[PDB]
Curated annotation (Swiss-Prot), chain A:
Widely expressed. Expressed in neural stem cells but absent in mature neurons. It is found in: Cytoplasm; Cell junction, Focal adhesion. Phosphorylated by activated epidermal growth factor receptor. Phosphorylated in response to FLT4 and KIT signaling. Isoform p46Shc and isoform p52Shc are phosphorylated on tyrosine residues of the Pro-rich domain. Tyrosine phosphorylated in response to FLT3 signaling. Tyrosine phosphorylated by activated PTK2B/PYK2. Tyrosine phosphorylated by ligand-activated ALK. Tyrosine phosphorylated by ligand-activated PDGFRB. Tyrosine phosphorylated by TEK/TIE2. The modification N6-acetyllysine is found at residue 32. Disulfide bonds: none annotated. Residues 34-195 form the PID domain. Signaling adapter that couples activated growth factor receptors to signaling pathways. Participates in a signaling cascade initiated by activated KIT and KITLG/SCF. Isoform p46Shc and isoform p52Shc, once phosphorylated, couple activated receptor tyrosine kinases to Ras via the recruitment of the GRB2/SOS complex and are implicated in the cytoplasmic propagation of mitogenic signals. Isoform p46Shc and isoform p52Shc may thus function as initiators of the Ras signaling cascade in various non-neuronal systems. It comes from Homo sapiens (Human). The modification Phosphoserine is found at residue 17. Interacts with CPNE3; this interaction may mediate the binding of CPNE3 with ERBB2. Interacts with the NPXY motif of tyrosine-phosphorylated IGF1R and INSR in vitro via the PID domain. Once activated, binds to GRB2. Interacts with tyrosine-phosphorylated CD3T and DDR2. Interacts with the N-terminal region of SH2B2. Interacts with phosphorylated LRP1 and IRS4. Interacts with INPP5D/SHIP1 and INPPL1/SHIP2. Interacts with TRIM31. Interacts with PTPN6/SHP (tyrosine phosphorylated). Identified in a complex containing FGFR4, NCAM1, CDH2, PLCG1, FRS2, SRC, SHC1, GAP43 and CTT. This is SHC-transforming protein 1. In response to a variety of growth factors, isoform p46Shc and isoform p52Shc bind to phosphorylated Trk receptors through their phosphotyrosine binding (PID) and/or SH2 domains. The PID and SH2 domains bind to specific phosphorylated tyrosine residues in the Asn-Pro-Xaa-Tyr(P) motif of the Trk receptors. Isoform p46Shc and isoform p52Shc are in turn phosphorylated on three tyrosine residues within the extended proline-rich domain. These phosphotyrosines act as docking site for GRB2 and thereby are involved in Ras activation.
Swiss-Prot record, chain B:
The chain holds residues 489 to 500 of 796 of the full protein. This is High affinity nerve growth factor receptor. Trk also stands for tropomyosin-related kinase since it was first isolated as an oncogenic protein which was the result of a fusion between the tropomyosin gene TPM3 and NTRK1. Belongs to the protein kinase superfamily. Tyr protein kinase family. Insulin receptor subfamily. It comes from Homo sapiens. It comes from the Eukaryota. The gene is NTRK1.
Length: 195, 12
């Protein structure tokens, strides 16, 4: 049954794989990263600074220090959803890897816009814009199963040489899709020197 | 799901 546009990958009679367009579409985080740039709504929850080395992963050390600080924020400064107060002492496997949670601005609705190499977080609080092109320094970014298993956390860097773990929640349709966006704009430019 | 850049975190 060939006649429309001949060939097999353009005869409107095949499996999925978009086909109608050359790009692909994929989820909205990527389709917009290449387009004008996605834009969700995640409220910021202050910023915690660290004093440990950098360029490190550690599957156990990252969950102990990341959950430790993130615990003092969702607990000491209410704002999260399911971790305000419920007796959560537990030990604290950590010798020299942390800093202090800064709750100077707990609750600051900001639009998380992700463009091709332009993670700009508009400010929906006092009509401002948290960086119109946050995509050059930073240091570590994530927020899926581990870390918070619900919220998003990304340590940034630029004004100072101290990684600042950013804790944000209530993104509105993000978690996995948002992780795909930050990763997209992440590998856009960043002066790809390529070793 | 650990978003990392090739400038700060190098893995290759």
């Amino acid at each position: 049954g060939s006649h429309m546009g001949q060939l097999g990958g353009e005869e409107w009679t095949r499996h999925g794989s978009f086909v109608n367009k050359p790009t692909r579409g994929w989820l909205h985080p990527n389709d917009k990263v290449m387009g004008p740039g996605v834009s969700y709504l995640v409220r910021y929850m202050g910023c915690v600074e660290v004093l440990q080395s950098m360029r490190a992963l550690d599957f156990n050390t990252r969950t102990q220090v990341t959950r430790e600080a993130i615990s003092l924020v969702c607990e000491a400064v209410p704002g999260a959803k399911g971790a305000t107060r419920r007796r959560k002492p537990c030990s604290r496997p950590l010798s020299s890897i942390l800093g202090r949670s800064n709750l100077k601005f707990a609750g600051m609705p900001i639009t998380l816009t992700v463009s091709t190499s332009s993670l700009n977080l508009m400010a929906a609080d006092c009509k401002q814009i948290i960086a119109n092109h946050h995509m050059q320094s930073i240091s570590f970014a994530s927020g899926g199963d581990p870390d918070t298993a619900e919220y998003v956390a990304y340590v940034a860097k630029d004004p100072v040489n101290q990684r600042a773990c950013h804790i944000l929640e209530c993104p509105e349709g993000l978690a996995q899709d948002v992780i795909s966006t930050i990763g997209q704009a992440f590998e856009l430019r960043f002066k790809q020197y390529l070793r | 799901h650990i978003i990392e850049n090739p400038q700060y975190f190098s893995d290759a």
